[PDB]
Structures are given as C-alpha cells and as structure tokens.
Design a protein around this ligand. Structure first.
Ligand code: CLR
Ligand code: NAG
Ligand code: NAG
Ligand code: NAG
Lengths: 48, 250, 115, 55, 146
C-alpha cells in the first residue's frame, strides 16, 4: 500500500527582493549627489 | 597675470580646483564619511549575536548598500580627475581593490561570506582613519620601517634553516609529533623561538636515559641556540624600529 | 561664430550636445514610463511589461541624471540666463522622472519574481 | 588607593619626570588605537574562521 | 501546538512571534510570475459568498476550481468536520483556515517520518526511498540529505 504524507508550511517577513535594495541604494546615492551639486551651484553662482 | 579673459583650460583647472576643494579639503564631508563608517563599525560590533540580528538583518543589508554606494561614488569621483593618477598612486590602489572585491562579491554571486565582507569594511575604516592626521605619522613610519624589517626576517629564517638541519638530525620518529614532519618541526622550533611555554616540550624529550643521555646534549644545544636566536631577533627588531624612526625624527 | 561651422564639424562647441543628450534620454525614459503605466492599468499583459530590464535602465537613469548635472555645471559660465534656465529645467524634469519611476518600481514589487 | 595617589601627587621631582614624559600621551594613544584596529580586524577574522562554523 | 490554542489561534512562542496564522478568505498560493497573482487552481479557505482577492489578470480568473466548497452557497453552508480541520492533504483544503508559521529563512527543518506496524512505531528505513513534491508548482525550496 502507498505510504504518503502531506504537510503545510507558512513563512513570512521577507525583508526585500532585489529591486528594493537597488532602489534604496541608488536613491541615497543620488540624494547625496544632488545635495553636493546644489551646494556646488550655489557657491559657484554666488561667486559670480 | 592681468588675465583679462580666461580660456578653456583655465576654466577646466578652475573646475578641478573646486572639485578638489570639496571632499578633499573640507572637514565636513570627511567627518560625515567617518561618522557613517563608525556607525557601520558599531553595527559590525553588534554582530556575533542573532538575538540582535533578527530585527536588524534588513537594516544591515540596507546600510551595506549605503556604504557600498558611497564608496563607489567616492571611487568614481577620484577617477573623474584622471584614471592615470588614480592607478599610479601608493594608496588609492588599495581602496580601489577593496571596493572592487566588495562590489564583485555583492552584485555577482560569491563564496566570499562575512569573512570577506567585514574585514574589507574595517580595512576601509583604517584607510579613512589614517587620513585624519594623528596616526598618519606612525602608520607612515611603520610602512617606512617594514622594508628594513624584511632583511632581518630573511636572515633570521636562513639562520633558522641552517640550524634546523642540526635540529632534524636528532628529530623525527623519536620524540615525535612536534619534531617530525620537517615543517611542523620548523614551526615548533619557531614556537620555541617565540620563547613561551616550552616546558611541555621540555617534558616531551625528558627521560631519555634519565640522567644524561642525549637528554643533556640535544637540550643544551637547542637551548643555547634558542636563547641566542631569541636575543638576536628581539634586538634586531627593536634596533631596526629605532633606526627607521630616526628617519622620522629628521 | 559660424554656428554654421560650429555645427559644422570635427566635433562641436562646448558641452551643449552633452546637455541635449539628457533631453533625448528623457524622451526615451518617458516613453518607457508611459508603456509601463499603460500595461499596469488596463491591458494587464505582464508577460511583456518591462519586468525583465530592471537594473540596466536604472543605471541609464543615473548616468542621465549625472550627465544633465555635469552639462548644467559646464554650461553655466556662459553668463547667459537662457542656457542656465534650459539646463536647470532639464535637471529638474530628469530628477522628477527618476523619482517617479523609483516610486513606480517600489510599488509594483509583488509582480516580478521572488527571492 | 586613590587617596594614596593623592599622597604621591607631591614630590616635585616626580612632577618634573611627569612633565618630561607627558608629551608621549598622544603617541601612546595613537599606538593604542592602532592596536585596537588590528585587534578588531583579527577579531572579525577569527570569529568568521573558527566561531561561525560552530563545530 | 495545543488544540485549544489551535482553536484560539493567538499563540506566541515566548518571543513575540505568532506560531499560528489564520489564512485569508479565498486564498490561493502565489505563482512564479509574481507573489500577488494566483495560478495554482487550488483554493484554501474557499468561500463563494465573498468576492475574490488578488484576482486581476486573465489567467488568474481562468483558474481556481471549487472542489468541496462548491456552489452550495458559502463556508457555513459548505459543511466540514474536525477531520477536515486537521487533514493536511489536498482536496480537503476548501475548509483549511489555520496553518503554522515560520521565520523567513527556515534552516534544517526536520522532515522526520515514522511508520506504524500494528505493534509499535519505527522510523523510515534506507530500503524505503522517498520522493518529494510540491502540489502548488513552486521552485524555491531545497532538501539536504546524505
Ligand atoms: C542604450 C542606451 C542609449 C539606453 C537605451 C535603452 C534601450 C535600448 C532599451 C531600454 C528600454 C528598452 C525597451 C523596454 C520595453 C520593451 C518591451 C518589452 O516587452 C521587451 C523589451 C523592450 C522592447 C525594450 C527594448 C530595449 C529598450 C528600448
Ligand atoms: C452545482 O454543483 C454541482 C455539484 O458538482 C455541479 O455538478 C453543477 O455543475 C453546479 N452547477 C453550477 C451552475 O455551478
Ligand atoms: C454536508 O455536506 C454535504 C456535501 O458536502 C451535503 O450533501 C449535506 O447536505 C451537508 N449536511 C448538512 C447537515 O448541511
Ligand atoms: C539534518 O538535521 C539534523 C538535526 O540538526 C542533523 O543531525 C543532520 O545531520 C542533518 N542532516 C543533513 C544531511 O544535513
């Protein structure tokens, strides 16, 4: 006779797939970039 | 001189002057980078503990991405001034290698594990901290002293080989498992050169013929050799240190 | 000079062209954003939505942002307000479109694949 | 023992020796920081080499 | 997990983690093309009286077969029993509500099998080779064995 069994497993709290990590990294990178560049433009324009 | 109207290359040199004015002379940007690196160092010290990492693993991944992207942004900004000068530098090669290994292990699958991710981060911690002045002189003179350390190390190893021939004549298959295997024998001799706790070895070859045997001879030869070599090595170390440090004092 | 000849050859005047490249990057990225929104809303054809090219067009996004910035900086010294307004408007629209696509991709996260 | 340290706070000759050796505080602090960094490096290396495997 | 907290469904493992979860109404397991689109045609907590969740897109709506909780009106109309409240098998899943829970990376989950032999209970033997299947067409699991 066929001895078989079945069971169920629920898992949760996936931290993040790949695009979430990619998005937060590039978002912080470009935020730093635009902040430094706004400072650059402000200084170089106010010298003139 | 008077410079009635600037040209294209004066404009380019001026632009590079503002580019090196920030993030290379401003203490604020370097202070922020050091603050971020000390924060991720604190999170590194918060590891070796899963009870903390269960609510922190996602945040650890995010701050890993943040420090990696600011590192590669710094490397790209350094490459902006020119690839030749960044390639031809004494120390920027190390930061480039660090970020290259870290990014290669990050984006592409790798067997690098924490044993690569964390030591590379603390190497970057060191490379940031030496730029702030009051340890730069000591690290500079350490790297100035090491080429003079090299000859002392080479002479010590050569002398230890030419005395390890005399060693291995009375070694192997008798008082074994530390005098055998000809490289484990060499490293046990090195252990005794470091001169701590060889009384286990002293009891190892003890009771050869319970009064003198070779229990006298091999022990006294190896002991006088050990004490002479240990004194010579420790001296040569401290004297090379002070010799290369006098170069600092000039 | 002979803009004529400027546009003549060998290469071209300063920057400029490098600024108008961000414009055509904005054109193509706006088209891709429109296709993404159109496929998300009505037709529901996730088979051919841009789930597949994910990081490479984000890298295109970021190099376009840096390019528009560098063009603005390299074109500001002409002393004329119109060029500065041109470059700053392009920078603002590129930044807005980047943030919009970042929000869109962060929203549609349960639809690509799972790790 | 802190009170004994306050006892030894006298003896101006010890004060002159302290003055002569007190400019090395920055140097010993720098070497202590170097020791701490190297200790941290090999701490994480040793944990990842022998503590992570848990055998 | 004790049966009284199986009925209650609010158990905690002394650390802040819910050890039991009641599944959403008209739930289907995710598919490969996305975790918000069902293509598995097997219904858990099947109830026809309520509208269908997570069921945009054509192939999602072209699947899902109500086996036990059929066109008899709803979950209280589609009567089940206790043996359908503990059967971890398929085709009894229309009245499956409460399942277990786990952290995200499970590690070394013990799949231990025992056999009754009319006198005692023994373990599965090396002559008794075993095959694995997932009945919802998923591909992000693996087994360690020697
Ligand atoms: C190479 C530089 C200039 C960046 C330009 C990127 C271009 C070449 C990329 C980015 C957006 C891309 C398109 C995005 C969406 C679609 C529809 C999809 O169902 C198949 C791929 C397809 C048809 C892509 C083809 C290539 C494409 C147009
Ligand atoms: C109602 O349920 C019966 C039971 O199987 C089924 O045969 C029949 O087709 C169903 N009718 C409709 C309209 O769904
Ligand atoms: C129990 O369910 C069966 C079909 O699932 C149905 O035929 C029967 O009438 C139900 N009994 C009651 C009391 O509802
Ligand atoms: C499976 O897990 C058990 C319990 O930890 C362990 O003893 C056994 O070695 C594991 N087997 C394999 C193949 O990993």
């Amino acid at each position: 006779c066929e001895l078989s069994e079945e069971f169920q497993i629920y898992v949760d709290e996936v931290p993040l797939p790949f695009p979430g990590h990619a998005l937060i990294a590039v978002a912080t990178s470009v935020v730093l970039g635009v902040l430094i560049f706004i400072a650059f433009v402000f200084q170089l324009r106010n010298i003139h | 001189d008077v410079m009635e109207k600037k040209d294209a290359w004066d404009v380019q040199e001026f632009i590079t002057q503002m580019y090196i004015k920030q993030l290379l002379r401003h203490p604020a940007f370097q202070l922020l980078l050091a603050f971020l690196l000390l924060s991720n160092a604190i999170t590194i010290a918060l590891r070796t503990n899963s009870y903390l990492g269960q609510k922190h693993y996602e945040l650890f991944s995010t701050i890993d991405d943040i420090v990696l992207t600011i590192l590669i942004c710094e490397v790209l900004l350094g490459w902006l001034n020119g690839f030749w000068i960044f390639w031809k530098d004494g120390w920027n090669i190390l930061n480039f290698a660090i970020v290259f290994i870290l990014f290669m292990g990050f984006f592409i699958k790798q067997l690098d594990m924490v044993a690569i991710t964390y030591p590379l981060r603390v190497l970057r911690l060191v490379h940031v901290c030496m730029a702030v002045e009051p340890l730069a002189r000591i690290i500079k003179v350490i790297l100035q002293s090491m080429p003079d350390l090299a000859n002392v190390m080479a002479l010590i190893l050569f002398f230890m080989l030419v005395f390890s021939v005399f060693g291995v004549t009375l070694f192997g298959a008798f008082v074994p498992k530390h005098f055998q295997n000809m490289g484990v024998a060499l490293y046990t001799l090195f252990i005794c050169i470091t001169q701590d706790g060889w009384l286990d070895i002293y009891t190892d070859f003890q009771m050869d013929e319970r009064e003198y045997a070779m229990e006298v001879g091999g022990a006294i030869y190896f002991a006088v050799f050990i004490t002479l070599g240990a004194f010579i090595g420790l001296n040569l170390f401290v004297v090379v240190v002070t010799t290369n440090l006098e170069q600092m004092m000039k | 000079m002979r803009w004529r000849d400027r546009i003549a050859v060998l290469c071209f005047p300063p920057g400029l062209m490098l600024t108008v490249a961000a414009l055509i990057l904005f054109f193509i990225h706006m088209g891709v954003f429109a296709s993404d929104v159109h496929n998300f809303c009505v037709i529901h054809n996730y088979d051919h939505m841009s789930f597949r090219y994910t990081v490479v067009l984000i890298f295109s996004q970021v190099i376009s942002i840096g390019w528009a910035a560098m063009g603005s900086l390299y074109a500001e010294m002409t002393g004329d307000k119109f060029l500065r307004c041109f470059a700053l408007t392009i920078l603002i629209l590129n930044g807005a479109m980047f943030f919009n696509r970042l929000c869109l991709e962060f929203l549609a996260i349960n639809y690509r694949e799972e790790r | 023992s802190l009170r004994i340290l306050k006892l030894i706070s006298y003896s101006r000759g010890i004060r002159t020796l302290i003055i002569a050796v007190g400019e090395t505080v920055y140097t010993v602090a720098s070497v202590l920081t170097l020791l701490f960094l190297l200790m941290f490096v090999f701490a994480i290396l040793g944990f990842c080499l022998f503590g992570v495997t848990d055998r | 997990i004790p049966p009284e907290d199986w009925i209650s469904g609010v158990h905690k493992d002394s650390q802040g983690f819910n050890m039991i979860k009641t599944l959403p109404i008209n739930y289907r397991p995710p598919s490969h093309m996305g975790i918000s689109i069902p293509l598995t045609d097997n219904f858990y907590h099947a109830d026809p009286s309520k509208p269908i969740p997570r069921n945009q897109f054509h192939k999602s709506k072209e699947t899902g077969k109500y086996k036990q909780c059929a066109n008899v009106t709803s979950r209280a109309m589609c009567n089940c029993s206790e043996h359908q409240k503990f059967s971890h098998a398929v085709a009894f899943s229309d009245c499956k509500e409460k399942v277990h829970r786990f952290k995200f990376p499970v590690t070394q989950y013990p799949v231990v099998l025992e056999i009754f032999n009319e006198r005692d209970k023994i373990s599965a033997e090396p002559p008794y080779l075993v095959t694995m299947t997932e009945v919802n067409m998923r591909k992000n699991w693996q087994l360690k064995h020697n």
